[model samples]
Target: SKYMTPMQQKLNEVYEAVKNYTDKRGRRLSAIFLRLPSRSELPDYYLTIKKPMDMEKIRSHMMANKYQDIDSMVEDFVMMFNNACTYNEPESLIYKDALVLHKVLLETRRDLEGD
Candidate 1:
């Protein structure tokens, strides 16, 4: 092993979870897995405030705070899904599919937390 940190490990698990879901057209709900801005792009205090793409901001926080646990990471994912897009603005079916996949992700995260 290359000696992954707990944060990196949890991120891998969550990424896997995200890949497990698919939209109605059988496309993977992998949008949440996109890469975040590098540390250089963040100004200080990004975590203390909520702005657009707060999830990415907080991922930067996770790096600064020493570790990224699955619990907080999943919560951020849910929040990002809620904030970054409107449920019906673009199209009903697409939004509905994302919504459904988001719910499943939540449930899956909850089950893991319980275990």
Candidate 2:
């Protein structure tokens, strides 16, 4: 994946800094070490910081894979449906902290639920 190397290095930095991080309710959220998630899981992650997209590459790729009119029309419809599930601007911080804070909270809640 195009993001593999840089993402790995950044995740390592996050792992190091939060090796023993605890949550407000005293949950041990981040351990000093975490097994790296698969590359496919990376998109579900939020970077410790965001980076500007490679717009040129995106444009090139989109142009290279330009679809038929019918396909494009369907894609636009799907985009509309997907956008309905999107958060409001103020609530968008959920996505901003998604990989770091939200993942921990989600896992902890799931674990508690199972218990």
Candidate 3:
């Protein structure tokens, strides 16, 4: 039998690295993005955004090994907060957080590429 995609293990680590990062509040950043916005709370969420992404989906996809390539995995990771920016106001904290995570995501990815 063949071994699992070892590269994916590293990718998973990257996900965990970002997911487990704690900020000034001492809470993991994942707390903010672990779940998708509640449609009942914000009726406009799904109406304007057709394709939704979040940490929950990323975790599920990773566990299922649904990811065929690193790029796709990274895309979902970056897009999670992207949807936030699109749905929420530009000046909103979520938007700022999205960009911050975008930077963090890419920076993490770049670290992987060196090896």
* Deviation in Å, model 3, residue 100 alpha carbon: 1.1
Tens-place lDDT per residue, model 2, 18-64, is 33445576755332113324446654332421322222322343345
Off by over 4 Å in 1: 5-8, 31-50, 54-67, 85-91
| Model 1 per-residue lDDT at 96 | 59
TM-score of model 1 (CA atoms):
0.53
Output the better candidate (1/2) by TM-score. Answer: 1
RMSD of each: 6.5, 17.7, 2.3
Clashes in candidate 1: how many?
0
Better of 1 and 2 by lDDT: 1
> How accurate locally is residue 103 in candidate 1, as Cα lDDT from 0 to 100?
77
Worst 10 residues of 1 by lDDT: 42-51
Estimate every model's Cα lDDT from 0 to 1.
0.57, 0.34, 0.80
Q: Clash pairs of candidate 1?
A: none
Which candidate model has the greater lDDT, 2 or 3?
Answer: 3
TM-scores of the models, in the given order? 0.53, 0.21, 0.85
CA shift of 89, model 1, Å? 2.9
Task: Quote model 3's TM-score.
Answer: 0.85
Worst 10 residues of 3 by lDDT: 1-10
Q: Model 2: what TM-score?
A: 0.21
Residue 109 of model 3 has an lDDT of: 82
After superposing candidate 2 on the true structure, give the runs of residues whose Cα lies further than 4 Å from its correct spot: 1-17, 31-33, 43-115
Candidate 2 achieves a global lDDT of 0.34
